[PDB]
DNA sequence: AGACGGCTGGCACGACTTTTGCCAGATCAGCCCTGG
DNA sequence: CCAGGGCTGATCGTGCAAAAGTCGTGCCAGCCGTCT
């Protein structure tokens, strides 16, 4: 990283023409997702951390 | 968005997620213990409702 | 004047510099709507 | 009078693995207990407008970036400034050093002089003396900022330049003979240095929340306070009637045995949890009984106690009480403390009595605080007036209490009147 | 300027606390099989 | 058809002690204040 184009790449957007819609496949959902949740706990009150 | 500060008490978007997560966890850990058909079907029905 | 986060600061900077030019970008509420729709089993995206 | 293998009983004992689990069940706090309890609840099947969209706040880093956006830097200068302001703490002093910043940029063209130029450019931002390498170049910026008309400015600059240790050790005499500066006319210059707002970046946002959870409650019913448990915080389990009413109906041996075993496990778990709650309540009541004086009168009027003293008052064991009194916070009108905080070491006083260590530590705190500022009271004199009170602790214990209290030594806190 | 007294802290030594790590068996009651 | 024997599972049980840890108090070294 040169730290001079990294900042400029943050503020960029696409042409975004012709928005579409369709049904979602489980493979598509797993492609969207970054991880899987397993517990109902939201925030710990002993350290106040995720 | 905590109310009293001590407890955040997330509502109306995290209660449903918590219900689904905990019920799915119980059903998943009950499915591999060779649980009776009535119990497993009843748990699946509650998962569907959630 | 609204949820275009990357555009509010740019417009303020241009106004202070004396330029009076706008960089429209894309509102944040539309991104929120796309995320909320994708939270249901409905694929939605923008093509090119 | 011999070496020989012998044998004679006077004791008894017995235990099972599930009993071991039940006895370790009471070693842990309630909030951490609920996780494991939910874990067992998940395994056993027959056991069982709002304000939103808050406002966005302006922290120090966001404010500094806002000010950078409206200042005329080049692209490289802007990248350097963004890195520098990213490496800024809440107090306002940058954490990593300048060569580390240069390495983070990782550009051959980028130089220490260029980074210094950019940093000094952003030093003049709204919180003065922000992003300073250390304390030496944070007070100096504000001294230079102040107009020359006010007196003692040159004196303050001379002290702050290279006499920082000389002022830190409170060695005013050596500071005088080093600076060749005026006698007792340096006091106003030192006060000018004092009134300089150290840690300037702190004041951008100071909101701190309330995070308190009570495990045991005590309330004063016109004398002899009675103790109650936290109704909301306490856990509870209820058997499931639907699944408890289908073990006999099922004609399959597998299902019947499954339901029977799970019923047994659930009932044992409920019994263990109830026993843990009862034991905790009894222990809390007994400790509050033995600590009635301290709640009324203050910390320095605390009687020393040991786990034996509280275990003899009940039928439990010392190990049992030690396991129960871990990570338990009881709430009292005076404040929130820990159940393990009450137990303390004892020291013998005059007249045969004993005084609790925390009581003597608090007494030392108030005695040291209520002292003349010109002549500090040392550890030996502290021992002397404690012996006059009749406590007679050693100077070593006085020093240990003073150090654990974070008060610097007497010769360190001496100051000009 | 040097020696004497004093102050403080690290390290050590009894004396006493507290923390964890143990891992079943026998005994009794109801039901089923069988003898009278 | 009624009484005796077998057998299986249901039920009972939150303390002992060993080792790590903590406590108070002394001994000694190094820096500092002050008079000669």
Curated annotation (Swiss-Prot), chain B:
The protein's PTM annotation reads: Acetylated on several lysine residues in the presence of glucose.
What biotechnology does with this protein, per the record, is: Co-administration of salinamide and rifampicin or salinamide and myxopyronin suppresses the emergence of resistance to both antibiotics.
Domain of life assignment: Bacteria
Q: How does it assemble?
A: The RNAP catalytic core consists of 2 alpha, 1 beta, 1 beta' and 1 omega subunit. When a sigma factor is associated with the core the holoenzyme is formed, which can initiate transcription. The rRNA transcription and antitermination complex (rrnTAC) consists of RNAP, NusA, NusB, NusE (rpsJ), NusG, SubB, ribosomal protein S4, DNA and precursor rRNA; S4 is more flexible than other subunits.
The job of this chain, per UniProt, is described as: DNA-dependent RNA polymerase (RNAP) catalyzes the transcription of DNA into RNA using the four ribonucleoside triphosphates as substrates.
Tell me its family: Belongs to the RNA polymerase beta' chain family.
Name the record gives this protein: DNA-directed RNA polymerase subunit beta'
Encoding gene, per UniProt annotation: rpoC
UniProtKB/Swiss-Prot annotation, chain C:
Q: How is it used?
A: Co-administration of salinamide and rifampicin or salinamide and myxopyronin suppresses the emergence of resistance to both antibiotics.
PTM annotation, UniProt: Acetylated on several lysine residues in the presence of glucose.
Signal peptide residue numbers? none
Q: Which family does it belong to?
A: Belongs to the RNA polymerase beta chain family.
The protein's job, in short, is:
DNA-dependent RNA polymerase (RNAP) catalyzes the transcription of DNA into RNA using the four ribonucleoside triphosphates as substrates.
Assembly and oligomerization: The RNAP catalytic core consists of 2 alpha, 1 beta, 1 beta' and 1 omega subunit. When a sigma factor is associated with the core the holoenzyme is formed, which can initiate transcription. The rRNA transcription and antitermination complex (rrnTAC) consists of RNAP, NusA, NusB, NusE (rpsJ), NusG, SubB, ribosomal protein S4, DNA and precursor rRNA; S4 is more flexible than other subunits. In pull-down experiments interacts with CedA. (Microbial infection) Interacts (via flap domain) with Escherichia phage lambda antitermination protein Q; this interaction renders bacterial RNAP resistant to transcription pausing and allows it to read through termination signals.
Name the UniProt record assigns to this protein = DNA-directed RNA polymerase subunit beta
Q: Which organism is it from?
A: Escherichia coli (strain K12)
Q: Which gene encodes it?
A: rpoB
């Amino acid at each position: 990283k040169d730290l001079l184009k990294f900042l400029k790449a943050q503020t960029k957007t696409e042409e975004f023409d012709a928005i579409k819609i369709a049904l979602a496949s489980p493979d598509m959902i797993r492609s969207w997702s970054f991880g899987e949740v397993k517990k109902p706990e939201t925030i710990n009150y002993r350290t106040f951390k995720p | 968005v905590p109310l009293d500060g001590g407890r955040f008490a997330t509502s109306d978007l995290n209660d449903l997620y918590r219900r689904v997560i905990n019920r799915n966890n119980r059903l998943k850990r009950l499915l591999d213990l060779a649980a009776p058909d009535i119990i497993v079907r009843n748990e699946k029905r509650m998962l569907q409702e959630a | 004047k609204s949820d275009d986060v990357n555009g509010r600061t740019k417009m303020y900077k241009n106004i202070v510099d004396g330029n009076h030019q706008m960089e429209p970008g894309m509102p944040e509420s539309f991104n929120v709507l796309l995320k909320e729709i994708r939270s249901l089993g409905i694929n939605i995206e923008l093509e090119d | 009078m011999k070496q020989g293998l012998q044998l004679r009983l006077s004791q008894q004992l017995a235990m099972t693995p599930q009993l071991q689990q039940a006895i370790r069940l009471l070693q842990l706090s309630t909030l951490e207990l609920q996780q494991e309890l939910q874990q067992a609840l998940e395994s056993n099947p027959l056991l069982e407008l709002p304000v939103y969209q808050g406002e966005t706040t302006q922290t120090l880093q966001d404010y500094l970036m806002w000010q950078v956006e409206l200042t005329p830097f080049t692209d490289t200068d802007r990248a350097i400034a963004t890195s520098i302001v990213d490496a800024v703490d809440d107090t306002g002093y940058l954490t990593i050093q300048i060569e580390d910043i240069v390495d983070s940029i990782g550009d051959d063209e980028i130089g220490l002089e260029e980074v210094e130029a950019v940093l000094k450019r952003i030093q003049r931002f709204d919180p003065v003396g922000v992003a300073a390498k250390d304390l030496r170049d944070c007070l100096l910026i504000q001294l230079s900022q102040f107009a020359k008309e006010t007196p003692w400015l040159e004196e303050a600059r001379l002290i702050i330049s290279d006499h920082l240790d000389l002022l830190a050790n409170h060695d005013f005499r050596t500071l005088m003979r080093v600076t060749r500066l005026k006698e007792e006319v340096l006091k106003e210059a030192v006060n000018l240095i004092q009134s300089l707002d150290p840690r300037p970046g702190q004041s951008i946002q100071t909101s701190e929340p309330e995070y308190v959870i009570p495990d045991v409650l005590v309330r004063k019913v016109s004398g002899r306070w009675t103790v109650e448990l936290n109704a909301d915080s306490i856990p509870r389990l209820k058997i499931n009637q639907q699944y408890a009413a289908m073990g006999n109906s099922a004609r399959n041996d597998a299902d019947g045995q499954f339901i029977r075993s799970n019923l047994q496990e659930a009932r044992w778990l409920i019994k263990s949890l109830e026993s843990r709650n009862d034991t905790l309540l009894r222990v809390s009541r007994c400790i509050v009984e033995q600590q009635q004086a301290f709640f009324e009168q203050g910390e320095e009027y605390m009687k020393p106690m040991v786990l034996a003293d509280i275990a003899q008052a009940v039928e439990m064991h010392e190990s049992t009480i030690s396991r129960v009194t871990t990570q338990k916070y009881l709430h009292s009108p005076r404040g929130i403390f820990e159940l393990k905080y009450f137990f303390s070491s004892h020291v013998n006083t005059e007249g045969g009595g004993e005084a609790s260590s925390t009581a003597i530590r608090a007494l030392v705190k108030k005695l040291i605080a209520a002292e003349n500022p010109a002549k500090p009271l040392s550890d030996s004199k502290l021992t002397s007036m404690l012996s006059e009170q009749g406590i007679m602790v050693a100077r070593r214990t006085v020093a240990k209490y003073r150090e654990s209290l974070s008060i610097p030594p007497s010769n360190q806190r001496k100051q000009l009147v």
